[PDB]
Design a protein around this ligand. Structure first.
Ligand code: HEM
Length: 153
C-alpha cells in the first residue's frame, strides 16, 4: 500500500511521537473528545469529564493515550504486515466497545492535527502524505474485519 520511501517517512515522523508518547496521546484524545463529544460517551472511564481543563488534569486519560499510541506504533512498525496485531484490535472495538469506523476516521484526523500543532513547520507535505496513507491502510484493514462481523454500523 506504501512504498519503502513512504514507510521510511512514517517511522521518521513516529520518532517525534516516541520522544513524548504521553503528551502526544493526551492531545490526540482531547482533540477527539472536544471535536466530537459523542466519542466521549463510549468511555465510562471518561464520561465524567466535561471541560478540557478537567481532561487536561486527568492522569488516567494520559495513561489511556499511552496505551493507544503504543498499540498504533506497534502496528506501524510492521509496515503493513500487521494482520496478527490488528485482528484482536478490530474484534474488541467492534464487539466489545462498539466503535463505528467513523470514529477511527475521526482519531486519524486528530493525529494529523496534533502533529502539525506540536511540530509547526517540521511536519512536511511529504511526511503528511505518508502518515495519511498509513492511517488509511490501518483503517481500511479494520474496515474489512468490521464487514466480516457485520458491525453494520
Ligand atoms: C488509533 C486507533 C485506536 C487504537 C490503536 C486503540 C487502542 C486501544 C487498545 C489497545 C485498547 C485496550 C485493549 C482492547 O480493549 O482492545 C483500547 C480500548 C478501548 N478503546 Fe481504543 N483504540 C483506538 C481507537 C478508539 C476510538 C476511536 C474509540 C472511541 C471513539 C476507542 C474506544 C475504546 C474503548 C471504549 C476502550 C476500552 C477502554 C477502557 O475502559 O479501558 N478506541 N483501545
Amino acid at each position: 500500500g506504501l512504498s519503502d520511501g513512504e514507510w521510511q517517512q512514517v517511522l521518521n515522523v513516529w520518532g517525534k511521537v516516541e520522544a513524548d508518547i504521553a503528551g502526544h496521546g493526551q492531545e490526540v484524545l482531547i482533540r477527539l473528545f472536544t471535536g466530537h463529544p459523542e466519542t466521549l460517551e463510549k468511555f465510562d472511564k471518561f464520561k465524567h469529564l466535561k471541560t478540557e481543563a478537567e481532561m487536561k488534569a486527568s492522569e488516567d486519560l494520559k495513561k489511556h493515550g499511552t496505551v493507544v499510541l503504543t498499540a498504533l506504533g506497534g502496528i506501524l512498525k510492521k509496515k503493513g504486515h500487521h494482520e496478527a496485531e490488528l485482528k484482536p484490535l478490530a474484534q474488541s472495538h467492534a464487539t466489545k466497545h462498539k466503535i463505528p469506523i467513523k470514529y477511527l476516521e475521526f482519531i486519524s484526523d486528530a493525529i494529523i492535527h496534533v502533529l502539525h500543532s506540536k511540530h509547526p513547520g517540521d511536519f512536511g507535505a511529504d511526511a503528511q502524505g505518508a502518515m495519511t496513507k498509513a492511517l488509511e491502510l490501518f483503517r481500511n484493514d479494520i474496515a474489512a474485519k468490521y464487514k466480516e462481523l457485520g458491525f453494520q454500523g
